Amino acid sequence: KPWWEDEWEVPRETLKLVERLGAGQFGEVWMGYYNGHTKVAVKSLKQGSMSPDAFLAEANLMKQLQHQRLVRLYAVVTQEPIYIITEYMENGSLVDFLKTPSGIKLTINKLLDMAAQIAEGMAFIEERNYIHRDLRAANILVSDTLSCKIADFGLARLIEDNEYTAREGAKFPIKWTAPEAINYGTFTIKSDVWSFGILLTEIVTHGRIPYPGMTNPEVIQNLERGYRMVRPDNCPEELYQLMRLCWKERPEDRPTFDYLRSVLEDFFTAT
Numbered sequence: 491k492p493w494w495e496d497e498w499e500v501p502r503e504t505l506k507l508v509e510r511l512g513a514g515q516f517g518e519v520w521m522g523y524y525n526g527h528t529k530v531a532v533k534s535l536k537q538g539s540m541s542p543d544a545f546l547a548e549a550n551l552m553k554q555l556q557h558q559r560l561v562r563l564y565a566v567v568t569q570e571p572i573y574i575i576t577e578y579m580e581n582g583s584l585v586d587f588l589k590t591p592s593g594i595k596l597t598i599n600k601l602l603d604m605a606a607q608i609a610e611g612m613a614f615i616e617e618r619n620y621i622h623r624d625l626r627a628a629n630i631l632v633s634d635t636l637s638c639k640i641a642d643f644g645l646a647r648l649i650e651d652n653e654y655t656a657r658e659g660a661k662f663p664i665k666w667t668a669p670e671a672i673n674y675g676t677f678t679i680k681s682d683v684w685s686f687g688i689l690l691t692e693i694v695t696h697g698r699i700p701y702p703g704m705t706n707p708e709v710i711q712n713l714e715r716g717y718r719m720v721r722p723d724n725c726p727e728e729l730y731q732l733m734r735l736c737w738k739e740r741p742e743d744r745p746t747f748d749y750l751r752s753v754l755e756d757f758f759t760a761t
């Protein structure tokens with residue numbers, strides 16, 4: 491729909507940007523208010539840094555992926571500087587939250603609760619025939635009620651035929667990305683499952699970097715030998731064995747997100 495018919499378009503005047511939360515090569519992210527009263531996150535595109543069509547692609551995707559467990563598109567402003575406005579998440583990124591005094595005090599019960607919320611959002615993505623491709627604790631956001639939502643849909647894609655193949659100069663975070671995606675550029679929902687196992691290590695270590703004391707070449711080398719990440723300190727063995735299922739060698743042998751959600755809810759209620 492053109493901007494004058496798009497239900498998501500709002501006049502820029504409806505927005506007041508209050509506090510800058512981040513800034514990077516491609517723009518800034520602010521906390522602001524819509525129509526005086528409603529707190530929102532506003533992402534602005536730095537003109538020239540990247541295509542406006544490329545920037546807005548993220549918003550268009552979020553229009554197709556609406557669920558309680560996913561950060562919700564609020565609005566767009568499609569005149570320069572282009573804004574994407576989203577649901578504000580008061581405790582920020584999970585990777586950051588788990589290091590704060592509140593995050594530090596969480597019991598394993600609550601960490602298992604949050605893991606299940608994340609699996610629940612990923613089960614919706616899976617059911618809709620999407621993949622995320624950037625699943626990691628930096629891209630989970632936390633609410634003021636300590637519930638978690640999936641965020642950052644820039645790499646997210648509709649799957650037509652089970653798999654998306656990236657450019658052959660395309661580069662991904664080695665520690666979080668499935669071998670088949672690093673090696674062949676081939677991504678499926680089973681690649682997100684691998685990433686989810688790595689995300690579980692970040693939850694249990696309160697946001698530590700995966701594969702402690704290893705470089706990327708060393709991670710690749712160990713994986714090809716058949717090793718997986720060493721048991722993190724204070725990780726319940728049940729949770730470690732669930733991670734190992736996510737890291738099965740064949741993508742098709744890895745579990746579904748619906749299964750993962752089910753198991754983690756059982757771990758939670760039993761703790």
Ligand SMILES: COc1cc(Nc2nc(N[C@@H]3CCCC[C@@H]3N)cnc2C(N)=O)cc(OC)c1
Pocket residue numbers: 511512513519531561576577578579580581582583628631641
């Ligand atoms: C200081 O970082 C905070 C961020 C947010 N919130 C958000 N940050 C988003 N990106 C940031 C970019 C730079 C890196 C941090 C974030 N990922 C994206 N979206 C939201 C959102 N929908 O709320 C809330 C906060 O309150 C405690 C602190």
